[PDB]
Amino acid sequence: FVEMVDNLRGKSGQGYYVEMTVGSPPQTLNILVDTGSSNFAVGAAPHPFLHRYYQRQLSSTYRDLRKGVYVPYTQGKWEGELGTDLVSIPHGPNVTVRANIAAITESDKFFINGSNWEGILGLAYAEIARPDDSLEPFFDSLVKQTHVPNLFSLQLCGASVGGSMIIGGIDHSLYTGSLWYTPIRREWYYEVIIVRVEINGQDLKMDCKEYNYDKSIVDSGTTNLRLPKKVFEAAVKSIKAASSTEKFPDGFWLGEQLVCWQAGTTPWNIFPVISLYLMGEVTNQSFRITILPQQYLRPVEDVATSQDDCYKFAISQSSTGTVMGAVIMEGFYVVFDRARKRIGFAVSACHVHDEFRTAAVEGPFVTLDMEDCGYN
Amino acid sequence: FVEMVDNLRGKSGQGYYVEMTVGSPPQTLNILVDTGSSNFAVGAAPHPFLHRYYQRQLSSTYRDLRKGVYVPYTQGKWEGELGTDLVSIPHGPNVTVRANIAAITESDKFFINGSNWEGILGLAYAEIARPDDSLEPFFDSLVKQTHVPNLFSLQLCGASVGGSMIIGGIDHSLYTGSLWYTPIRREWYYEVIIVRVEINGQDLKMDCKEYNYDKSIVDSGTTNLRLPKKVFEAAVKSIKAASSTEKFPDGFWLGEQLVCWQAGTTPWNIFPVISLYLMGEVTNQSFRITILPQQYLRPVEDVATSQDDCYKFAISQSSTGTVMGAVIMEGFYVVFDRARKRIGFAVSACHVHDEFRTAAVEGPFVTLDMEDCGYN
Ligand SMILES: COc1cccc(-c2cccc([C@]3(C)CC(=O)N(C)C(N)=N3)c2)c1
Ligand SMILES: COc1cccc(-c2cccc([C@]3(C)CC(=O)N(C)C(N)=N3)c2)c1
């Protein structure tokens, strides 16, 4: 696994990507690692933002599936042509596989101008694969055609930024202390159940069933930690009041303006550590992950309307549930243990850390009626 | 007002715009009519998607305000340089005014590739103007510097598509029957209070306070009718079950895949009319607006992965409240009566109508405790 270490580039703002090769002979592309979707879609036409794109004409091994896909988002969309071809991951396992590729032929607000990636690798499960759950995801093909074990792990770092995708197992050099595991509630998204939240050290006497309304998921393709309204509403109230040494703008919390200081002058300690307790592997047992304010206030880089230490509030609202984005994942080594229906967390050997507090994964804790926190 | 009739172009998918002129001599630009924001922002650099952009260097009358703006959205952002200049609306009032312009110098996922507009005219109020409520919105400058009365009205049409912005008053040729008025609850967004909802004819025994959690607004710059989760959840359940002659995809309702038939074969009548009751002008009195399925199922045009009559579900979820978008507004002539803190609705003389049902604005109805439907 020394080969796979540090095989990711990019930020949480713009995503993390791994180099991939597609077709015979190998076309090299930079592809977003996205645990929030299940399609392997690559740009296959010269959209002007793209550095590279998939040229099927040049591949011995491509096969058209004579079938198209349309994938709308909030303001976004992409659209392509389903086929299959030979995929390999240079700095991954030393195998090669026949995976589905959606050749993106049209898109709106999908690719980022000035980004350095050209497709997405949806690592989530069949059930949310477009167009339907028979479009077998990449990772399933990988395990299903090779001797690669059914799990991968992710260490996302970054102050641009880097990280590691260890396909097939775990690499002990990427975390400290112990890995704790929460169940994958169902294999569609990487859905997990949050059972209690705390800010700094004090919870939120909130029906935990809210924390997971209607969903809680782990998504390397979402930037923020994203909370539902009631919990966000509740959350911010408590972070806001906690963080009243100083008075910041009332719309900033809603991510409608950003906030700024200068070099050195970022007020670390006015801000609370935040703690999510996740359902554990055993009845009535949980564990917790604790994020520093480094994680939920992320530098907004080159705003030319300043030369200051600006930051956006990396927590936000959701109609679709909790989303533990790259802001949360940057603190931890996250193991996606598809073989045992569980996701493991450990302190990342690369989390940004002051000489004061830290990120933490701790347990066990005793929590009753955890199964009641999942929405049905 | 014969001059202002039909001075809007575009769709609900891509927005409606009015021709404007800025600077001396007049630079012509196509600008989005957006009642969901309060900034007049125009593209002022040669972003490649843009047909035209504001060239300050060429204006006698421009004045720099030596101050910048940054405006983030969900995935989106823009950023510019505050100044003021001379603005006129060719097919508007025969005046000219000194308004604030944000010259957009940088943006991500803001402009649409293949769109024909180049800025936005935020018609909402100071309170949500970025950076703060002292950046006086266009319309306030308009009324405040001319004899133009403090109201405008909008007729949005469309099967591309058209419409009319009547600045300064009402034009009786754009609606049928009577105008009914709901209070502007507060002057930030165009916030209104929904007090009951019905599908086909049957309500939703839902605490009306949900319908407005935390906000209900009228937004010509939002495409969908957008409902909060509980109400959307509730809503769809009732539209879904109502519309079970046929079985459509389970993810389509969430706007994650679109749905299709062919010429002639759109099943009109399986789908219910929807009714929103809005708080009226008098204690315990309301009125209602009724939308046909034409309105909430909008053609998705050139999907090349078909030659069928496709449609997206024009209703969706929200962390930020109800939003009555261009899907709702297409049915009605909407009067923004800033002078009397109220918004008027009437059947649009241009709503798309089958030889069966219709859009409707009706009243009065007796509804108790309407003031309790507003979130505080
Ligand atoms: C940190 O990761 C990202 C940063 C910016 C954008 C994206 C991204 C771009 C395009 C599509 C996706 C998507 C496939 C769809 C989506 O909205 N989510 C939340 C997701 N998981 N992946 C992400 C990821
Ligand atoms: C039908 O109107 C539109 C269709 C597509 C896009 C837009 C649009 C594009 C860019 C910004 C806006 C914005 C300023 C921000 C926003 O998200 N909303 C909801 C809004 N009212 N206007 C709209 C409007």
B181: Cα separation from own chain's centroid = 17
Instruction: Tell which residue, A17, A24, A6, has the closest CA to residue A123.
Output: A17
Strand bridging mode B175-183 / B342-348: antiparallel
What residues have CB less than 8 Å from B355, skipping those under 6 apart?
Answer: none
- Scan for tokens 């015979």, then name that residue: A24
8 Å CB contact of A109 and B106: no
Residue type, B117: W
Residue A155 lies in a domain: yes
Residue A365 lies in a domain: yes
Resolution (A): 2.5
B310 and B369 belong to one structural domain: yes
Boundary of a domain, candidates A148, A163, A178: A148
Active site residue A308: no
Strand partners, B64: B83
Residue B314 lies in a domain: yes
Instruction: Report whether A209 contacts A375 (CB < 8 A).
Output: yes
B45 and B185 belong to one structural domain: no
A368: Cα separation from own chain's centroid = 29
Boundary of a domain, candidates A148, A180, A206: A148
Residue B271's CATH number: 2.40.70.10
Is the Cβ of A46 closer than 8 Å to some Cβ of chain B?
no
Boundary of a domain, candidates B115, B148, B181: B148
- Ligand 1-lining residues (CB < 6 angstroms): A 12, 14-15, 32, 34, 36-37, 73, 110, 120, 219, 221-223, 326
A157 and A130 belong to one structural domain: no
A119 and A239 belong to one structural domain: no
Residue B69 lies in a domain: yes
Residue B221 lies in a domain: yes
How would you class A250 by CB atoms within 10 Å of its CB: exposed for 0-12, middle for 13-18, buried for 19 or more?
A: exposed
Chain A residues whose CB is inside 8 A of the B306 CB are 68
Identify the helix (H) or strand (E) that includes residue B235.
Answer: helix B229-242
Residue A48 lies in a domain: yes
B123 and B167 belong to one structural domain: no
> d(Cα B29, Cα B118) in Å, to the nearest integer?
7
What was the experiment behind these coordinates? X-ray
> d(Cα B360, Cα B365) in Å, to the nearest integer?
14
Q: Is the CB of B326 under 6 A from ligand 2?
A: yes
Instruction: Report whether A203 contacts A367 (CB < 8 A).
Output: no
Instruction: Report whether A295 contacts A331 (CB < 8 A).
Output: yes
Domain hosting residue B207, numbered range:
149-376
> d(Cα B157, Cα B166) in Å, to the nearest integer?
14
Instruction: Tell which residue, B13, B35, B217, has the closest CA to residue B120.
Output: B35
CB atoms inside a 10 Å sphere around CB A170: 18
The count of structural domains within chain B is 2
B197 and B341 belong to one structural domain: yes
Residue B2 lies in a domain: no
A46 and A172 belong to one structural domain: no
A98 and A215 belong to one structural domain: no
Looking from the CA of A345 toward its CB, the CA atoms found within 13 Å total 30
Residue A4 lies in a domain: no
In A192-308, DSSP assigns E strands to 194-199, 216-218, 225-226, 259-261, 274-279, 285-291, 297-299
B213 and B118 belong to one structural domain: no
Is the Cβ of A299 closer than 8 Å to some Cβ of chain B?
no
A310 and A164 belong to one structural domain: yes
> d(Cα B133, Cα B282) in Å, to the nearest integer?
31
Which ligand is nearest to the Cα of residue B129, counting in written order?
2
> d(Cα B191, Cα B171) in Å, to the nearest integer?
24
How would you class A132 by CB atoms within 10 Å of its CB: exposed for 0-12, middle for 13-18, buried for 19 or more?
A: exposed
Sign of CA dihedral A241, A243, A244, A246: negative
Chain B residues whose CB is inside 8 A of the A229 CB are 213-214, 228, 319
B278 and B289 belong to one structural domain: yes
A184 and A218 belong to one structural domain: yes
